[PDB]
Each structure stands twice: as structure tokens, then as C-alpha cells.
Amino acid sequence: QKINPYRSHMKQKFQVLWEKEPCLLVPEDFYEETTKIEYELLSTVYLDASSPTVVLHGPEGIGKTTFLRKVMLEWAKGNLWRDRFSFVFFLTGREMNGVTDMSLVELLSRDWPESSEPIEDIFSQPERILFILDGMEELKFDLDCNADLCEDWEQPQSMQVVLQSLLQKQMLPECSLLLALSKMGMRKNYSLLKHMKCIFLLGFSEHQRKLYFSHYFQEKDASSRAFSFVREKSSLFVLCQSPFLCWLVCTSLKCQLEKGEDLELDSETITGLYVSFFTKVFRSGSETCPLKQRRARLKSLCTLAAEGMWTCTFLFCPEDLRRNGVSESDTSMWLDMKLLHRSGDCLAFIHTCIQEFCAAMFYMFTRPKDPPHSVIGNVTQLITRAVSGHYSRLSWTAVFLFVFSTERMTHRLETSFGFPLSKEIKQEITQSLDTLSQCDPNNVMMSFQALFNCLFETQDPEFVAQVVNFFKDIDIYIGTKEELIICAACLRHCHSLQKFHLCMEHVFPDESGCISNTIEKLTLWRDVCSAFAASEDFEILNLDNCRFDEPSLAVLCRTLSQPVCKLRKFVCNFASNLANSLELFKVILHNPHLKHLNFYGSSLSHMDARQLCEALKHPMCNIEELMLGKCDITGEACEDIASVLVHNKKLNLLSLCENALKDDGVLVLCEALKNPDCALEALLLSHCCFSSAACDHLSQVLLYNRSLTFLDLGSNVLKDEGVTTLCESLKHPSCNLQELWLMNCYFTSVCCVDIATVLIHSEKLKTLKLGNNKIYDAGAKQLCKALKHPKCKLENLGLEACELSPASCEDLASALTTCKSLTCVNLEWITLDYDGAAVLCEALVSLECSLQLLGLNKSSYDEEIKMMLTQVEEMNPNLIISHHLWTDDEGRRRGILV
Ligand SMILES: Nc1ncnc2c1ncn2[C@@H]1O[C@H](COP(=O)(O)OP(=O)(O)O)[C@@H](O)[C@H]1O
Numbered sequence: 001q002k003i004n005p006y007r008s009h010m011k012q013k014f015q016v017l018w019e020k021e022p023c024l025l026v027p028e029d030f031y032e033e034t035t036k037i038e039y040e041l042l043s044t045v046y047l048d049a050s051s052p053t054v055v056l057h058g059p060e061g062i063g064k065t066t067f068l069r070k071v072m073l074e075w076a077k078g079n080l081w082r083d084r085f086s087f088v089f090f091l092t093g094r095e096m097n098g099v100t101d102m103s104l105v106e107l108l109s110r111d112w113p114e115s116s117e118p119i120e121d122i123f124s125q126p127e128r129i130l131f132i133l134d135g136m137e138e139l140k141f142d143l144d145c146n147a148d149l150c151e152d153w154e155q156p157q158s159m160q161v162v163l164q165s166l167l168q169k170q171m172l173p174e175c176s177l178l179l180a181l182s183k184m185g186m187r188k189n190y191s192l193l194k195h196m197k198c199i200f201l202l203g204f205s206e207h208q209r210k211l212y213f214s215h216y217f218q219e220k221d222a223s224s225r226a227f228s229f230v231r232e233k234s235s236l237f238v239l240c241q242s243p244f245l246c247w248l249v250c251t252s253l254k255c256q257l258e259k260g261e262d263l264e265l266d267s268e269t270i271t272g273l274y275v276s277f278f279t280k281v282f283r284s285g286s287e288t289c290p291l292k293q294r295r296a297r298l299k300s301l302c303t304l305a306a307e308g309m310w311t312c313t314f315l316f317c318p319e320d321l322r323r324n325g326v327s328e329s330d331t332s333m334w335l336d337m338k339l340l341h342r343s344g345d346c347l348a349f350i351h352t353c354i355q356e357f358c359a360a361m362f363y364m365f366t367r368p369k370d371p372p373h374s375v376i377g378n379v380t381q382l383i384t385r386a387v388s389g390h391y392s393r394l395s396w397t398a399v400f401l402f403v404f405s406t407e408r409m410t411h412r413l414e415t416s417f418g419f420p421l422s423k424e425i426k427q428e429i430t431q432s433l434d435t436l437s438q439c440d441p442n443n444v445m446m447s448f449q450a451l452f453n454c455l456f457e458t459q460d461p462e463f464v465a466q467v468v469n470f471f472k473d474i475d476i477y478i479g480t481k482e483e484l485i486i487c488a489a490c491l492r493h494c495h496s497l498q499k500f501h502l503c504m505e506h507v508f509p510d511e512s513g514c515i516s517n518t519i520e521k522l523t524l525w526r527d528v529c530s531a532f533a534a535s536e537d538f539e540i541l542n543l544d545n546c547r548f549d550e551p552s553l554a555v556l557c558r559t560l561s562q563p564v565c566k567l568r569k570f571v572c573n574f575a576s577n578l579a580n581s582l583e584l585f586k587v588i589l590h591n592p593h594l595k596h597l598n599f600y601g602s603s604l605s606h607m608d609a610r611q612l613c614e615a616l617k618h619p620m621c622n623i624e625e626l627m628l629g630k631c632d633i634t635g636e637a638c639e640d641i642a643s644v645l646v647h648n649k650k651l652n653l654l655s656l657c658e659n660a661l662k663d664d665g666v667l668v669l670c671e672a673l674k675n676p677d678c679a680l681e682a683l684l685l686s687h688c689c690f691s692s693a694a695c696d697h698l699s700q701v702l703l704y705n706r707s708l709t710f711l712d713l714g715s716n717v718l719k720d721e722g723v724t725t726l727c728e729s730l731k732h733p734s735c736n737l738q739e740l741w742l743m744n745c746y747f748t749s750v751c752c753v754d755i756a757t758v759l760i761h762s763e764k765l766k767t768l769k770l771g772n773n774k775i776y777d778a779g780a781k782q783l784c785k786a787l788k789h790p791k792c793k794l795e796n797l798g799l800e801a802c803e804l805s806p807a808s809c810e811d812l813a814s815a816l817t818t819c820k821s822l823t824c825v826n827l828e829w830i831t832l833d834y835d836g837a838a839v840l841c842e843a844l845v846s847l848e849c850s851l852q853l854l855g856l857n858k859s860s861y862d863e864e865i866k867m868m869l870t871q872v873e874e875m876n877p878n879l880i881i882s883h884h885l886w887t888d889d890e891g892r893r894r895g896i897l898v
Helices: 005-018 028-034 036-045 064-076 093-097 104-109 119-123 159-168 183-189 206-216 221-232 234-239 243-259 270-285 291-310 318-324 328-336 352-365 379-387 395-405 407-417 425-438 448-458 461-468 481-491 518-534 550-560 578-590 606-616 635-647 664-673 692-702 719-730 749-761 777-788 808-816 834-845 863-875 887-894
Strands: 053-057 087-092 129-134 176-181 196-200 340-342 347-349 473-478 499-504 540-544 569-573 596-598 625-627 653-655 682-684 710-712 739-741 767-769 796-798 824-826 853-855 880-882
Touching: 005 064, 005 087, 028 036, 028 206, 036 053, 036 064, 036 196, 053 064, 053 183, 064 087, 064 129, 064 176, 087 093, 104 119, 129 159, 176 183, 183 448, 206 221, 206 243, 221 234, 221 243, 234 243, 234 270, 243 270, 270 328, 270 352, 270 395, 270 407, 291 318, 291 328, 291 352, 291 407, 328 340, 347 352, 352 395, 379 395, 379 425, 379 448, 395 407, 395 425, 395 448, 425 461, 448 461, 448 473, 448 481, 461 481, 473 481, 481 518, 518 550, 550 578, 578 606, 606 635, 635 664, 664 692, 692 719, 719 749, 749 777, 777 808, 808 834, 834 863
Parallel strands: 053 176, 053 196, 087 129, 129 176, 473 499, 499 540, 540 569, 569 596, 596 625, 625 653, 653 682, 682 710, 710 739, 739 767, 767 796, 796 824, 824 853, 853 880
Antiparallel strands: 340 347
16 A cells, blocks of 8 residues: 555544544444445445535434544545545534634644645645545534635635635535535535535444344343333334434433333433433432532533533533533543543533533523523523524524423423422523514524424424414425424414415325325325414415425315415416316315415426416406416417406406517417407516517507506517607507506617607606616606606606716706606616716705605715715605615516515
8 A cells, every 4th residue: 555644643543533432332343234335335436536525414313423434444544445535634513613714724734744745745636635524513604605715725714715615616626525414404505515415324223223232231131121122112213223312222221220110211202312311321320419419510511511502612621621610520420421521632522412402401500690691692592593594503402492391391300300490491482482483584584494393392282382373474395204294293283374385395105105104194284284274364375396296286275275265375386287287276266265376487388378278267266466477488378378368357467577478479468458358457578588579569559458557578679669669659648558667678868759758748657667778868868858847747767777977967956856746766876976976966955856765876886975875865854765676576576586
């Protein structure tokens, strides 16, 4: 083998570490038998020579860290990737947390012996390097790609930006990465990961569990007794799959055997298993200690764990132990009872999960007399940080805290420990959850998955109901059967839901078609759907990228079609199939309260459109607003859609944005609208890829429709002939058009005079949005003169990003002080100088101005103009300056957002 001293140093160091870090020294043969499949998969996936990045997937406690340590140790002895990988660097979140500002070169050199190859020399061939990011969920900073990404390793940079660049492969694209994340980590980082590869850890099996039990128990008879005892219990045996939970069960059984009491264990939930483990180890490890001193020791350990969790520190220096109140004898006591262990020259908890367990246990010792710790947050802060999706770093703690809220669990804790515990934790949690429920959902971005997990783990149906009924808008993603059962347990007895957003995949039968699972799955789905019909406030239902089958969707339609339900808005994204279409037709036919449909993103064909139009032809339909944005509808399919407008007189809003009609759908719609019988009032055709050829036909609509009022034809190549034809059509007062949206129509200022005519002649046009068009100072001048003409009944005018000039300001200055009916003007992205800004501000200050809303970006100006704008805002409380005034409103009206 090639001579290498970094490899030898890593081999020695992690060979030493492998015999102390794990809870028990598992035999090497048995361990490699347990995880042989994943080892082979990794060996096959890294023998292929941007290298793809593979991430280990699984819940906490399966052994991802141990697996990574074993793999890289085997590499260190050279039995793996001998001719593939030359240098492998192990990076853990806990050791990088203490780093404030340091370059990657120094980070790699901190453990790289000097008497070796230079770092630049080893980096000259970055195709042979592997960066194993282990336990990145223990980091103090979350990953959101907000920060800038760097490409140079030599230059000092912060840890967050370096990690982001390495993850996104903009820094050393040819390097290989090995990751280990949980389910929540995958959910948070799915967007960030590219070329992602998935490897799943399976844990222990039947024979593996038996062998591990026999290895843990050096004896035979009681070992077989314990194995049988865990065998008769289905839930305990299922939870025994995780090696850490298996070790917890083994040590709890050992404590029970050494105590002499009969084998008893509460295995309803994982948290119950943790509580039993802690109770029995505490009872077995303290027998000659007074209960006052026992309580003091437990409180000191709990405060230490809570401080470690809140400060994101997992290596405890003896100074920290002295500060928190831990003595040498107490340290020896916990080392003997196997709750802490040496990680070199410092101490660390036996496992991170036990660490947040003790951190949550700390909150049971609340003392009103004691002042706030100023470092550890209160219950409300912990709940907010755990249930919110921004950080989601102390979720597990909250979970344990939730289990501590139940009367039975706290009674068991008080009985076992012997000293009373705080009983206001449940009330405080309820108040905090109510407070966050009262907050607007947009500014909080609450992660309902963590809250639902806590509610499922607490097993308090009345408390679950009280918590769930606080929230009105529920967003949920269901990708696993465990997620499905958790959601069913949370929403079985919900009767306050009003807005539901569901992203549900990979759950209903696609593999393993056994008789069991699936029938129960359907029952779970029926229990979930029961919330739709059990609450008389259900308004909006949004199925985003959902994957249904025939029986599940049939059950959902049966639930929604009941007359007791009052669903109003149905937003179905990326879901339209033959069975899906038929079931949606059943929903539309049987529901009289349904009025708003948004099929944005759902790909449709000619047959699908024909079936939908045939269903809409039914006279029982009470549908009013219909949006089919980005449905890939062509002109011929519009032939069916037009037929709907022939019969459906209740419909009054139609949006067909982001289509490819190419004047054919426009011609068909105009021909349908020729009949003076349609009650359509709003039509949106943005980005329909249609030209001015059909615009003349649209002209014939404006002279024949007395009901159509709102027309949006934006983001279409209309040039000047189209807009001139539209103006000629709108010259006649007989037109009933009220609002016109012609942004990004690619017209110039020469045709603006025609617009300058219609603003004088049209007495019914209230809103005109001509933004994002190259109309220069000249066209601005004719528009301003048209407003100056004192017969213009125009209210809203949007000329954003029109490439205006400061010379136009004077023309604007006269307009705002002359047009009395002008209320809102959006003139964003205008270049202003001192002279133009001064006259504009004077015009705004002048009392003759009737403007109420001004769309302009104040931040994009120099100090003088910004100061003048602030002054004019101060002197005019009745005028509001804003940016992005109509973007969200336009998106909502077109259905792009929802
Ligand atoms: N195959 C196995 N045999 C014996 N013990 C295991 C095995 N896999 C994991 N463990 C134990 O489970 C614990 C898992 O901890 P860790 O390696 O940090 O992974 P995780 O982060 O998933 O908990 C380790 O302390 C280890 O002792």
C-alpha cells in the first residue's frame, strides 16, 4: 500500500475511539453482518470513476454515525476504496460549532500532521477527496441558501457559507460527499440536495435482535426469558428494531432483573420507553443517596443538558460541570450508571437523544421564585423554536416535554422519583400553542409535522383536541405510513378546520399488496377525511401533487359530496387523470356549495378537457370562478370550453393563463361570446402566446358583451396594431369593459395617443395596467395630457417599469394635481433626479392631489430623494407609498399563487 501518514493517524485515532464511544462493544463479525447490505451499496456506488452525493436516511438511533465511523475506519486500514479514495475527512457538527471564522484549509489542517504532504499538493487532485458530514443536525445554523456561496478554499470564510458551497457543489464540484440526515433533515434539505442518492439503514432483524440480546446478557436462561418477554409484546418488539432502542430495552430489563421485580415495561410509545429506561437506571444507580441530594443531582444534570442543547454544545468541559453544579462523585455515579461517558478529555451524554430527554426533564423543575436563566429559554420559547419550520432544532425536546404534560406520565415520574414536579407545564404549553395559533400563518411558517408528532406522542385525546382546534389553517405533507397514522390520530376529532393544504404521496398501494396495512390505511384516510365533513367552516381545500388511487379518491369524493359539507374553493395542482377526472366530476355534480376551481399546473389533454366541459355542462353545477392556468390547453380544446360559456350562466370568472392558444382559442372564445347570452364578467388570457390577429375578434366582443367587465391580456405580443384595434373598439361608450390589464404587450409610445383618446372617451374604464412596456417620455406626455383632460373617469393606473425619465416628472406633476378621479398610481422603477423629484414631491404635497396609493421603491434612491420622499410621506398621512403593489394581487387573481 502507498505510504500515507494522515491515513495512519486517522486509523490509529478512530481505532482508539471505536472501543470507547459506543455504549457497548458489539462484536465486529455480528456488526458487519447487520450492516453488510449498506456497506456493499456504498462500495458499489463510490466505484464509478460532478460526483453524486448519497445521504443515509433513517430515524435517530439506528447507527448512522457508527456506520460512517466503521466505513471510514475500514478505509483507513485500506480494506475499502484502496484505489479509489486517497484522503477522507470527517466533519461533525459539534466540533465545527465552536469554530467562529476559519477557512477550510485550516479546518482540514487542525487534524492533519505537519510532517506530511502539503495541503495545496493534496488539493491539486480534488477527485480523490471525500467529505463526510456527520450529524449536521447538531449545528447552530440552518441551511437556506440565503448567504453567498464561495469558490475559494484558501480565503477565510464563515462555516455556514463554506458548508453551503460544499453542499451545492459550487466549491470543488468533483469532490465526493457522504451525508447522514434524518427524515426531518431530508424534508428540510430536499431542495438544496442535487443529484441526490438515497441509502436506507435497516437496523436489526429477528436473528440479529436475538444475537444482540444474547451478547448483551452473558448468561443464557434470563437472556432467553427477556427475549421471550420482548417477543410477546408486538409494539415493544417492533420498536426494538432500532439498535439504540434495543440497547435501552436490554439495559432496562437488566435493571429489572438485578432489582428482582417481575418484568414490566410500558412500550406504548418511544418516549414511554425512554421514560422507563431513565426511571429504572436512576432507581438502580442510586440506593444509598438521600432524596434531597438525589433531586439536587438530577436537577444539576438536567440543567447541564438543557444548557448544552440551547447553546448547541455537546462536549462538556469540567469547567462547565463545575458551573452547572456537578461534582466528581456525582460524575462517577453517572459514569457507573451509564448516562455519560468520556469523549477524550471531556464528557458527553451517552447519546444525543438522552441529552434532549434530560433537557426536557429540566423543564419539570420550574421555580417561580428563581429568575430567568438568561441562557435557557422558557417553555414558550422552546415550543416556538421546535414547532416552527425555520429552525426545527429542538423538536425532540418538545416531544418529550409533551409527554411530560400528561397527568399519568407526570404522576409516574413523581411516584418513581419521590419528589413533586411542576404541574403548570401543560397549561403553559396550551397557552403558547394558542398564542402561535393566533399569529398569522405567513409570518410564522409553522411546521405542522412536529406539532402532530408531539400530539401523537402525548396520547391525550382531550389535549390533542384542544391543541388542534386552536389552528384554523393546516398544511401537511404525508409521505410515510407513520405520518399517515400520526395525522389520522391528530385529525380524527378535529371540528374547526377551515383551510387545508395536503401534499400526500407514496402511501396508498403501490407495492407490498398484503391484505393488512391497506384496509387500515383506508380507514386512516377516512378518519382524516372526517375532519372535512365534521367542521362547518371548511372553505379551501388544496391538493398539491397528491397521489391517489381509486378507492382512496372514491372515499374522499364520498366524504366531500355529502350535503352537510360546505367546501367552497378547490385548488388541485398537478393531479388530473381519467379516474381523477371522473371523481372530480362526481364532486362537482354532487356539491352545490362548490363555486371556485383552480386546476393550475394540472396537465390536460383533448379528452380530459372534453370530459371536464361535458361535466360542467350539467345544469346542477354552481361553479362561478374557474381557472386552468398552465393546463397545456390548445385551441381545439377551447372548442369544448367555449361550449361551457354557452350553457353555464352561473360562471362569471374564467382564467386560461399560460396556454398556447395561438389565436385559435381566442377566436373560438370570441365566437362563443358573440352570443348576447353569456354572463361571463372576468376573462384572463395572460401569456397565451397569441398575436394581434385575433385581437380584431376580441374587438367584436367588446361591442357585443354587456356583461364582460374585466379583461386581462398581459404578457402577450400585441405590438401596436393590436392595441390600436382595442382602443378603436373601446372608443364606443356602449362597451361594458371596466378593467384592462395590458402589461408587457410590447407596444411603443406612438400608439399611446390612441390610448390617450380612450381615456377621454371611455366613461366605464376604471383600472388600466399598462406596465412593463417601453413607453418613453413622449408617450408619458400624451398619457398625462389625457389625464389632464377633465372628463377622464380613471381610478387606477399602473405604469411600472416603463423606462420613464425625470423629464416626464413635470408632465406627471400636472396630471396628479388635475385628474380628480385618479386614486392609485403605480410608477415603480422610474429614474428620478433632484429636479424631477422636487416637483413630484411638491405636486404630491399640493392639496389638489387626490392620489391615495403610490407604487414606488423608496430604497432605490439616493439620500436626498429618499429624505424628500420620507418628508412628503410625513406631511401626507392620506397617501401610502408601497412597492410590489399589485404583484401578489395579480397572482391571486390569475391563480398563479394558489
Ligand atoms: N449494528 C449495531 N450493533 C450494536 N449497536 C449498534 C448498532 N448500530 C447502532 N448501535 C448503537 O446505537 C447507537 C447509535 O448512535 P449513532 O451511531 O450516533 O447513530 P444515531 O445518530 O442514528 O443514533 C450507538 O451508540 C451504537 O452503540
